[PDB]
């Protein structure tokens, strides 16, 4: 499901090595570290991100994302 | 063969860790993770990318690409 | 705890392979090598980073950081 | 020897995992992993690269380059 | 000690996989591959770097550097 869509408001590198992004007022994390640099680039330029997951409630994990 | 040539319309990081880019209305994916940041930069800056593969039908895999 | 928040004043790659950043007049280092490229881009593009750690005194280690 | 000097006209990631760049009308490839992102950045920003090798004929391999 | 401080005049990827930079008219090389991309970004954007080592004569090796 399309959990959120918009610019990345902020991102955070976590001590457990996961990465968190806030999109549309909701926070999502991922343990896909390949995504770390891709997500940060998306944030600096303001690309529109679309967090895709099975659980869309804030604080959920995701491993699929589209960049527009 | 030269399957497609143009700007990257959108890119998508998949759950199986492959990366998908849409060029000239067709989608192609690759499992060469070195390409992810290169392909995103190309998308960001607006470079013309050329998807090279043996099978050119949308949904096909690729591991060779030219940046202009 | 939120140890420091502001722009990265300078960064330093150390001989032991840890990385140091100076934020808000205080220095912090980290041994997470994924953080190196992320911190440098944060520095080049002027992002506001938040150093998160248990010990906030200058010279302390950290492994969590927020990019705004 | 200084085989070629100028902007990277285009680059290409090959199926065998080597990388090709076209400088001054001639093509050169390399199998040095580390060079790939460095060459792409050089291409992105338009730096003047100098391909250095023993054989300077188009289609030759190289593992030394200067970024200007 | 602070061997040199200034912009990176040029950088060079060497055949033995070490990386050379020229700062303040002196050349320095490093075998830390993590530094390669960091040094090239510093060069690309004009940061002031500070080469830190025990031997500061041109042609010396270094593995510590500050970015401003």
TrEMBL record, chains A, B, C, D, E:
Gene behind this chain? stx2e B
What job does this protein perform? The B subunit is responsible for the binding of the holotoxin to specific receptors on the target cell surface, such as globotriaosylceramide (Gb3) in human intestinal microvilli.
Q: Name one GO cellular component term.
A: extracellular region
Q: Which keywords, in A-to-Z order, does the entry hold?
A: Disulfide bond, Signal, Toxin, Virulence
Q: Name one GO biological process term.
A: symbiont-mediated hemolysis of host erythrocyte
Q: Is this entry keyworded Disulfide bond?
A: yes
What GO molecular functions are on record for this protein?
A: toxin activity
Q: Which cysteines are joined by disulfide bonds?
A: 3-56
**Protein name (database record):** Orf protein
Q: Which species is this UniProt entry from?
A: Escherichia coli
């Amino acid at each position: 499901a399309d959990c959120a869509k918009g610019k990345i408001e902020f991102s955070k590198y976590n001590e457990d090595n996961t990465f968190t992004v806030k999109v549309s007022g909701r926070e999502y994390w991922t343990n896909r570290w390949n995504l770390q640099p891709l997500l940060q680039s998306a944030q600096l330029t303001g690309m529109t991100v679309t967090i895709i997951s099975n659980t869309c409630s804030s604080g959920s994990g995701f491993a699929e994302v589209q960049f527009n």
